[PDB]
Structure 1
Amino acid sequence: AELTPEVLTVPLNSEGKTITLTEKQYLEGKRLFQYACASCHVGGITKTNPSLDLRTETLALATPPRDNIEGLVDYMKNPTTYDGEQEIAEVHPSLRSADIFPKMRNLTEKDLVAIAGHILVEPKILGDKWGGGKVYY
């Protein structure tokens, strides 16, 4: 197997429009997801709240939905609870809260799209391992 454009094609918005990433971006998002998110989100689980993974099917039943790049860039700007009813930038790094979450300062809109690409591509590659936790290691 290898890394192909069919694999690097991910939803851009919820209307169906996709975008097709490149090797260089996917690696950038893995590198930036490490720097920024892996401390709590390593492997697609969430250590400080295991009930909530980055599985593509979880990001689908999110409100607003999150299984596309725009939905994710928006989470990373202004994050919410799963039902959308609260903003949690106070306890979840985002551009909004980049003063209290320094690692978010030096990120640019292209960085955030790298990171979401990664998140949406990675389960195409690993499947159940991504968001499964230690059962699947």
Structure 2
Amino acid sequence: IDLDEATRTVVVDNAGNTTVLTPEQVKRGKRLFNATCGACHVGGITKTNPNVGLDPEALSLATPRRDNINALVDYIKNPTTYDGLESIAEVHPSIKSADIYPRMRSLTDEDLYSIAGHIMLSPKIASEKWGGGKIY
């Protein structure tokens, strides 16, 4: 089995529209995610706050929905709590807190799009370990 066209299609928006990630995008993401996100979100789990995981099920229950590329990209632009009552940009990496966190001082849009695509795509490949944890 390959990383074919069927398995590279992910939700792009709330509606449900589904775009396709080019293989280059996949690579760049896996790189960017491992370089910046990996230290705390290795394996699709949140190391500091294990309750708020990164698996698609938890993203589906966040407020608002975080199970599509657009909402993940917006979350990077402007992060909120699990219920979305207030912003936690001062305690989470974000473009809004670019001054606080120097890592994002260079990230571009495509970079964010590729990172979100990787986050969306990895549970389609592994399908049980993205956010699973030790057990799996």
TM-score bucket of the superposed structures, by smaller chain: over 0.9
Residue 53 of structure 1, CA deviation: 1.2
| 2:84 is equivalent to residue 109 of structure 1 | no
Residue aligning to 2:10? 10
1:58 and 1:101 mapped to 2: Cα distance?
25
CA RMSD in angstroms, aligned pairs only: 0.7
2:4 and 2:65 mapped to 1: Cα distance?
26
| 2:94 is equivalent to residue 94 of structure 1 | yes
Residue aligning to 2:37? 37
Residue aligning to 2:79? 79
Deviations 1:76-127 (A, max 9, x none): 0100111111101101101000111111110001100000000000001111
2:55 and 2:81 mapped to 1: Cα distance?
16
2:5 and 2:100 mapped to 1: Cα distance?
37
- TM-score, scaled to structure 1: 0.97
Deviations 1:63-83 (A, max 9, x none): 111110100000101001111
- Aligned residues with identical type, % of pairs: 60
* Contiguous gaps of at least 5 residues in structure 2: none
1:36 and 1:8 mapped to 2: Cα distance?
23
1:128 and 1:17 mapped to 2: Cα distance?
24
- TM-score, scaled to structure 2: 0.97
Residue aligning to 1:131? 131
Residue aligning to 2:121? 121
Moved over 6 A (4+): none
* Contiguous gaps of at least 5 residues in structure 1: none
1:82 and 1:53 mapped to 2: Cα distance?
10
1:43 and 1:5 mapped to 2: Cα distance?
24
Residue 39 of structure 1, CA deviation: 0.7
- Partner SS state of residue 10, structure 2: strand
Residue aligning to 2:68? 68
Q: How many residues align?
A: 136
